[PDB]
Design a protein around this ligand. Structure first.
Ligand SMILES: OC[C@H]1O[C@@H](O)[C@H](O)[C@@H](O)[C@@H]1O
Ligand SMILES: [Ca+2]
Length: 305
């Protein structure tokens, strides 16, 4: 049997819980493979110790979902000590980090694409709902709930949702922006504060970098009887799709957990076996990276998801 060590940055991350379960399902098809699954409990120091333990247990590959993206180098040097391949997933290392070790790979997404798609969804809905322009100034007065600072998805989704709106001719005014660290409760509390402050009446649209934060905002809006304000997310979690159906969420963007899990597993297994990373698969690896497309979702195409 081939042992592959896997770390998930925290099992209670909504999206990574989906990915974790998918990778375990994929491991069923490989009777020759054993995954050693680790919850890093949102602590890079805990993850680092877990990786040491995995390497001591003789794993032939690592699949690592970092707590801290900047810690890729640290993790690479651990893997290098055993000359073990490492497939990073979902939190993208720098190009320099990936190039520092020939056995380091990455599976994830084109982060900017999710921001562009989200911006196009907002543009569509804004044009179709001019009642959303509460102050009739032709600009979107928005608040934005950001993911972890420095996380490539948080940075790209935040930059590109606004860039895309602006590029499409829709001016925007940032009323508030803060991180809620990908978390529902923090997002709910932050949105509630914004709704309880002076100038809460100016808020026209809520933009969240993910669905779990969007869901927290939905709950805060409900508490204030402000559900007329639209909310947009990213991931297309099942719970989020149910809120698209009910009208509580205006739109989201599928982050394809199933294919990211499958690519991570396939590459890790090949690398563990000493084969080419993409051998026997149709994955297109571009300079050691696989990116899986995002797809926008709203009521108009929900039936497809
Ligand atoms: O790294 C974890 C984060 O990954 C992102 O791609 C997802 O959209 C977030 O929901 C998740 O919290
Ligand atoms: Ca306005």
């Amino acid at each position: 049997d081939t042992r592959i060590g896997v770390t998930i940055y925290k099992y209670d991350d909504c999206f990574m819980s989906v990915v974790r379960k998918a990778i375990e399902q994929d491991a069923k098809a490989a009777p020759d493979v054993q995954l050693l699954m680790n919850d890093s409990q949102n602590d890079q120091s805990k993850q680092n110790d877990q990786i040491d333990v995995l390497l001591a247990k003789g794993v032939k590959a690592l699949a690592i979902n970092l707590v801290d993206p900047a810690a890729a180098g640290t993790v690479i040097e651990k893997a290098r000590g055993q000359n073990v391949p490492v497939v990073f997933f979902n939190k993208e290392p720098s190009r320099k980090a990936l190039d520092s070790y020939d056995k380091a790979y990455y599976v994830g997404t084109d982060s900017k694409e999710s921001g562009i798609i989200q911006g196009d969804l907002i543009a569509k809905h804004w044009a179709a709902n001019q009642g959303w322009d509460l102050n009739k100034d032709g600009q979107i007065q928005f608040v934005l709930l950001k993911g972890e600072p420095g996380h490539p998805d948080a940075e790209a989704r935040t930059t590109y949702v606004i860039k895309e709106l602006n590029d499409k001719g829709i001016k925007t005014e940032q009323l508030q922006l803060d991180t809620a660290m990908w978390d529902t409760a923090q997002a709910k509390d932050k949105m509630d504060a914004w709704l309880s402050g002076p100038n809460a009446n100016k808020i026209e649209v809520v933009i969240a970098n993910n669905d779990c934060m969007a869901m927290g905002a939905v709950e805060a809006l409900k508490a204030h009887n402000k559900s007329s304000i639209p909310v947009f997310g990213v991931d297309a979690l099942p719970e989020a799709l149910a809120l698209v159906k009910s009208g509580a969420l205006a739109g989201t963007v599928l982050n394809d957990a199933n294919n990211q899990a499958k690519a991570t597993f396939d590459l890790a297994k090949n690398l563990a076996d000493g084969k080419g990373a993409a051998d026997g698969t149709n994955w297109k690896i571009d300079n050691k990276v696989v990116r899986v497309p995002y797809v926008g979702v709203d009521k108009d195409n929900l039936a497809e998801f």
